Design a protein around this ligand. Structure first.
Ligand SMILES: Cn1cc(CNC(=O)c2cccn2C(=O)[C@@H](CC2CCCCC2)NCC(=O)O)cc1C(=N)N
Lengths: 250, 10, 28
């Protein structure tokens, strides 16, 4: 996260850290959507261009964290993966279309003051809040500057941007399963996600029932916090049907 | 990073 | 069930430092 700030305790109880067994390192962010399922970006697990292809036994899940490098004894919870599910039509070859993946934990996690699941949007909520100008919140332990890393979870609030503007800021072919967010050059404020934040949740707070909903997933960008450029996120609602399918069948 | 307890690896 | 309701905030009716910025941006 660039131009963000330290999160307060319990601010994002659904934030998940994808941790590599060996070598032990931060791999990606993710989000807790229930006591047995974790949502993240597909490119965190599969991306041939970089020879990236992880399996269940290469990773660990760390929930309830605040500090990036410390083993938060009695606070965080480390879980193992039972099975991974990459969207069947994940386009890693061209534009990262449908950059989403579900992960099944071996054992259910117990909720606490620091561990709690985020909500998934329904048609109505997506419709009401997914509008340009409306701000969302992104969290991660990623780079603070374009390339130097944070000591603790970072957070930043960013406005959704009109589809046309998003399309005109890049050569990459944009699809309906994406949206971009960030401030325009003439808006004074700034901020963005960056390498290391991948798979992180883009959340909004519903003014109707006061709940937090995950609308996006940190998918891709071109540079970090550059003028005229915006962060792209996987449009979670569009892929909601796939999500439900996997969960109802496994 | 800080080494995490070993009983999580296995 | 009770997704999206944070134990240390919504549950105790306490707000975080910048959540208002989000709600203020949701023009009716
Ligand atoms: C710069 N950035 C990187 C990410 C995480 N995603 C990734 O790291 C993603 C995975 C693999 C390639 N990716 C990128 O974002 C690449 C662009 C990607 C676009 C889709 C087709 C493949 C190339 N960034 C290139 C660059 O920055 O110069 C998020 C941001 C951001 N919101 N600023």
């Amino acid at each position: 996260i660039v131009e963000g700030s330290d999160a307060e305790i319990g601010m994002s109880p659904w934030q998940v850290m994808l941790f590599r067994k060996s070598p032990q390192e931060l791999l990606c962010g993710a989000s807790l959507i229930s006591d047995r399922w974790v949502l993240t970006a597909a490119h965190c697990l599969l991306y041939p261009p970089w020879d990236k292809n992880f399996t269940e036994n290469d990773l660990l899940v760390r929930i309830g964290k605040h500090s990036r490098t410390r083993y938060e004894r009695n606070i965080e919870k480390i879980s193992m993966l039972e099975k991974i599910y990459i969207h069947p039509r994940y386009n890693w070859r061209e534009n990262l279309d449908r950059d989403i993946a579900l992960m099944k934990l071996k054992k259910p996690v117990a909720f606490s003051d620091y561990i709690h699941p985020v909500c998934l949007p329904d048609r109505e909520t997506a419709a009401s809040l997914l509008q340009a100008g409306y701000k969302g919140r992104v969290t991660g332990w990623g780079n603070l500057k374009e390339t130097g890393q944070p000591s603790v979870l970072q957070v930043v609030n960013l406005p959704i941007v009109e589809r046309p503007v998003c399309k005109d800021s890049t050569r990459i072919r944009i699809t309906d399963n994406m949206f971009c967010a960030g401030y325009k050059p003439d808006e004074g404020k700034r901020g963005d996600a960056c390498e290391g934040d991948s798979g992180g949740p883009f959340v909004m707070k519903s003014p109707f029932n006061n709940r937090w909903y995950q609308m996006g997933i940190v998918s891709w960008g071109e540079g970090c916090d550059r003028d005229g450029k915006y962060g792209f996120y996987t449009h979670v609602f569009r892929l909601k049907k796939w999500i439900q399918k996997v969960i109802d069948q496994f | 990073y800080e080494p995490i307890p070993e009983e999580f690896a296995q | 069930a009770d997704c999206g309701l944070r134990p240390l905030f919504e549950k105790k009716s306490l707000e975080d430092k910048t959540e208002r910025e989000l709600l203020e941006s949701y023009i009716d």
